[PDB]
Design a protein around this motif. Structure first.
Motif, mmCIF file in Angstrom:
data_model
loop_
_atom_site.group_PDB
_atom_site.id
_atom_site.type_symbol
_atom_site.label_atom_id
_atom_site.label_comp_id
_atom_site.label_asym_id
_atom_site.label_seq_id
_atom_site.Cartn_x
_atom_site.Cartn_y
_atom_site.Cartn_z
ATOM 1 N N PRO A 157 37.409 26.206 -57.307
ATOM 2 C CA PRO A 157 36.453 26.976 -56.574
ATOM 3 C C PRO A 157 36.024 26.249 -55.258
ATOM 4 N N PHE A 158 35.576 24.758 -55.527
ATOM 5 C CA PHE A 158 35.187 23.951 -54.266
ATOM 6 C C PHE A 158 36.167 23.789 -53.314
ATOM 7 N N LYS A 159 37.530 24.035 -53.514
ATOM 8 C CA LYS A 159 38.606 24.110 -52.488
ATOM 9 C C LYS A 159 38.484 25.475 -51.694
ATOM 10 N N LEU A 160 38.329 26.535 -52.309
ATOM 11 C CA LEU A 160 37.792 27.716 -51.716
ATOM 12 C C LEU A 160 36.779 27.688 -50.854
ATOM 13 N N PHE A 172 41.137 39.957 -58.216
ATOM 14 C CA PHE A 172 41.749 40.239 -59.525
ATOM 15 C C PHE A 172 42.466 38.865 -59.996
ATOM 16 N N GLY A 173 43.146 38.277 -59.070
ATOM 17 C CA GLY A 173 44.065 37.108 -59.419
ATOM 18 C C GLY A 173 43.068 35.906 -59.483
ATOM 19 N N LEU A 174 42.030 35.909 -58.541
ATOM 20 C CA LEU A 174 41.027 34.841 -58.962
ATOM 21 C C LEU A 174 40.258 34.823 -60.102
ATOM 22 N N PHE A 199 34.571 32.686 -54.745
ATOM 23 C CA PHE A 199 34.016 31.693 -55.461
ATOM 24 C C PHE A 199 32.583 31.920 -56.053
ATOM 25 N N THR A 200 32.088 33.013 -55.773
ATOM 26 C CA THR A 200 30.723 33.421 -56.544
ATOM 27 C C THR A 200 31.363 33.993 -57.850
ATOM 28 N N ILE A 201 32.324 34.729 -57.922
ATOM 29 C CA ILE A 201 33.076 35.129 -59.408
ATOM 30 C C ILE A 201 33.331 33.741 -60.154
#
Lengths: 70, 207, 207, 206, 203, 200, 39, 72, 71, 72, 72
Positions: free
Chosen positions: C182-185, D37-39, D148-150
């Protein structure tokens, strides 16, 4: 392998014999009778047709064999 | 002596063109180069990093450049008479495939040739086709891997040393390959990679 | 200068339509783009996050955007005299390959050209097409790796720092990547990675 | 008036039936969903928990429900003046592709339009070329911006369960094996999908 | 209504087999079962201990054993008056797919059809299918949680015991897997499991 | 009573052979062996320490050995009567799959046919093929878990007695487990108990 | 000599033998490969 | 059940070919009592039925192999 | 919706084929009104219509297959 | 601007075809000015043009599919 | 050198085609010196040579596609 060579050579001979006979008849020669040449040319054509058919079949078989997902 | 007719000449020529790819590219010329490329692509730790098309095109330009002298001699001895009706096809095939065999005979290892002799029981240079072609295929398979091992070794050392220096810091849970890939590409670039690679492959195929 | 008939011009044109797209894209214009995209995608720690059919469209629109000048030169100098019949196809081919040849010449390395010269054994811009093209494929696929590793550097930094931070907190049994991704993205989208990436790559190609 | 013959019409129709489905699904409407969906699947720590066919079918139905107004405009303004041959194909194509251009022109961050413009060196009803990649990139941005928020809540859950497990002096124990059940519990207890898709669509709704 | 000719009949028939895998197996019948199985195997702490080529086959047999009434009704009331040529294909298909929808409407959420009606007894096919897949997932997970509960309890209790036994650097995975296995096989695991599955999906 | 034409006979041949992996070799022969292999492999604490490509082959070579009487009786009493030509393809498959059903009944629990039949929902020997196979695989999973736990016990005791001395115990204990396992030669007694429990 | 079609007949018979053997071989090796690949 | 349907369709597609073969036999003898176009059409019908059968086979095998090639 | 278009196409091909067939049948009985130059045209048109139908079906099926194989 | 080039090519093809068809009509209707060596000489050139078009279509579509099917 | 020989073959074909065309042209004007039994044979020979060329091209492109289709 080492025999179909002889078959192709036999086809070449069956063609060249009738071809030489035809080229001998036209050029003013009293040796042929206009009937041997026609039948022999037709037979040579039939032989060549059989040869090319055998080649087509063998090539199809080889392509089918090699194209398998081993 | 005597020769064929035009029809059967065209027939056998087209049939040879049909056979060409499998019978000349996969088992006579360069089947070592694509194996080397595959082992390298697997050694970098990134399957299909370059597309297969560019690699298969490079491994074809390279084999054309390698076979240039043999194909030149074959061009002379085959076309130059036959372009001006000096020789017949039934002898042109032999006079053309003779120097190609003179090239393909070195890479072959005589141990495997003797094994295919035992496999076909031929009496003892001037080795017929059936007992020779596999004696070259297998002797190229047995050397592609011996090159590929030499290719692998440095990358394996890199992976092991990065794994060790990582473990030596108390991070026994993070995978090492994720950090190894950047350093792997860095080293593979820093040493003038691809030009040296091709050149060494060519020279090692030469003698 | 003669001119081929309308029964073989169409033949060679249709035939070249087979090779031209696939090969003259894979090893002539953009093969440094999909490699960088693949390496970046494998750097995000989330393989196949964008579908493999999306990147292969963006990496082609970038190509048809960066090939404005050379395709413009080809278009004018080849078509504009051809369609009004002042030149010949046999000559149009060369006069249209000229500017693309010069563009390709600009991008290759120094040593690779002379190495391929030896590997072809030709004496001493007038370089031929047979030996320039591989000396360009290699010059492309060798610099794509440098660009890729330069792209890799920050993600490796992020992974290492987050691993060290998690470890220094006294939590050894925690998977780092599951916290890193998540931090990467977020850092990627925080600096508009796609825009600047595509832009700097196209500008480097331009220079 | 100029037009096209029937042969070339059915030819270009059969041809478009090749490109249109694949890419006009990929680079036009819903590549901003399957990434989410993948994330999500990666976030739950359980890769391939729902089979890929179910996900790729649910995304397809969701995008055939997001594409009601655009497809309706296209249908009316294209077929109703063309299905009974009241207009030429060569112009009905543009009159029917206009709504798609408009919908694209809404969902777009200008930075990429400006990038590609300054790239192609051109100098307001933008053309077909300069809009498409600048839209694909502006979709790929908000895709990760949503993902990211997900990721945030499940990350918080993992962190808090790891801290709690460490508080009891049980350093040597896998955390994920205990985290996954609590993750699925909190997910299904807050109406997971009926809120996920809902927020996704309503964000795609501007 | 007219009757389709033989050409278009065999065309649509051979075509339906293409949609067969997804439309029959994933979004209609047993996706809940495979989700449950994957979850459960992720709960034993051993990925792919039983191969997937066994669990998938067992799931196929289970779904052919749980769809007895719907296939019965379809078979009789559709194929019986259609193998004797009394009704048309384009209508027999719907008369057969009616009780399949009557079964679907019982396992979907009693509220989600509204949440797909806004976004859109005798509800159409466009709305039900997603509003049924979503509310099959939202209960497959609700069952997987209950399946996870006991093994989580076992892991926690063994961790607490070994900690009370004074040891911190032993991984409880190898020391706890046998206990999970023996307790799961001692309580009639797969029998009761299948039973509960068929009962919650059938009632 | 009549046989089938050559085209449809070879078609059924190829199709029924295509069933090979799952419904013929995976749920009839060695769905018990490889599960035990995985359990024991993870028991040692070294997942995928031996290559799987050698374990699957060994399992296949073992399950071919353990299914010698069935396949041999099938060969003898089918391919000779088939080449006797007094039998038809359908009758051949049925009369040759009968011993498969006998073997299946040889390894199903004392009350599993009942559950899977009540699930098949048919009045109560005379059990068709659709009831046995899943009722077979279920009891197979059960007995495989049982034998796996049996093999698990001693290595758990070893881990306990080597860890009870107090330092990572598993790392310094792995060589001890491997040494004891090679000293006892667990393969022989393992495969022996496996066969003797497979005939029961 | 030889009869008329039995040459082509033998060619067809050898072709279908090749076909049947190749299909059997391919299917069997594919099954063996897809069984010999798991965890 | 459905297992019976397999060899039901099998013998239903084999009996037509058996009848076609018996017709071709009792015609090629020159026997009076069988029409040429009759068997010439019946053979084509058997061929198209065989095609339908192998197409259904291919579709079903492909579906079964695709569903059994996933991650549960 | 979209199934309506499927029904439209299928019941616009089937009825054309049935019309051609019943026309040929009413012709082979010698019923006055057919001229052997109207049945051939209708048969060829039904053939090309069926060909277009199966081509559209092939395209759509291949597309749906390539879609469902993504990640 | 490639879509414009494709539109121009298709326009030229369809224009040739429609002109040939209009000449055919104006011939068979009985009007003067056609001599059976213009209609029957363009019913082949139009077909050859359409064949060139469909060949280029097939080549471009195959190349596009090959590109978009790359193992990236 | 490989493009050189390809151009040489294409020229060997095109020059024969142009000779046949020029002969047919200078014969249809009525010019004395050209015979029908010459132009017909020349025509046929040019067509045969073009057929050989297209067959060679087809075999070569099939071989190239088969080569590039493999997996390294």
């Amino acid at each position: 392998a080492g025999q179909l060579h002889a078959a192709l050579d036999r086809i070449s001979d069956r063609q060249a014999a009738a071809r030489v006979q035809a080229e001998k008849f036209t050029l003013g020669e009293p040796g042929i009778a206009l009937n041997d040449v026609m039948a022999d040319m037709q037979k040579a054509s039939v032989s060549m047709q059989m040869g090319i058919q055998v080649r087509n079949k063998l090539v199809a078989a080889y392509q089918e064999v090699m194209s398998m997902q081993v | 002596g005597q020769s064929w007719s035009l029809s059967v000449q065209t027939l056998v020529f087209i049939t040879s063109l049909t056979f060409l790819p499998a019978i000349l590219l996969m088992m006579t010329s360069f089947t070592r180069i694509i194996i080397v490329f595959g082992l390298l692509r697997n050694a970098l730790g990134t399957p299909s990093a370059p597309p297969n098309q560019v690699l298969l095109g490079l491994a074809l330009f390279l084999t054309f450049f390698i076979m240039s002298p043999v194909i030149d001699k074959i061009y002379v001895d085959a076309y130059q008479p036959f372009s001006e009706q000096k020789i017949s096809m039934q002898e042109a095939l032999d006079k053309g495939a003779q120097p190609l065999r003179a090239f393909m005979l070195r890479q072959t290892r005589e141990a495997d040739l003797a094994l295919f002799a035992r496999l076909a029981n031929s009496g003892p240079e001037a080795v017929p086709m059936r007992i020779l072609l596999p004696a070259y295929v297998t002797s190229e398979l047995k050397t592609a891997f011996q090159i590929g091992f030499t290719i692998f070794i440095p990358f394996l050392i890199i992976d092991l040393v990065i794994a060790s220096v990582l473990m030596a810091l108390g991070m026994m849970m993070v995978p090492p390959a994720t950090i190894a890939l950047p350093f792997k590409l860095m080293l593979f670039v820093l040493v003038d990679g691809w030009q040296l690679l091709m050149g060494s492959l060519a020279q090692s195929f030469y003698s």
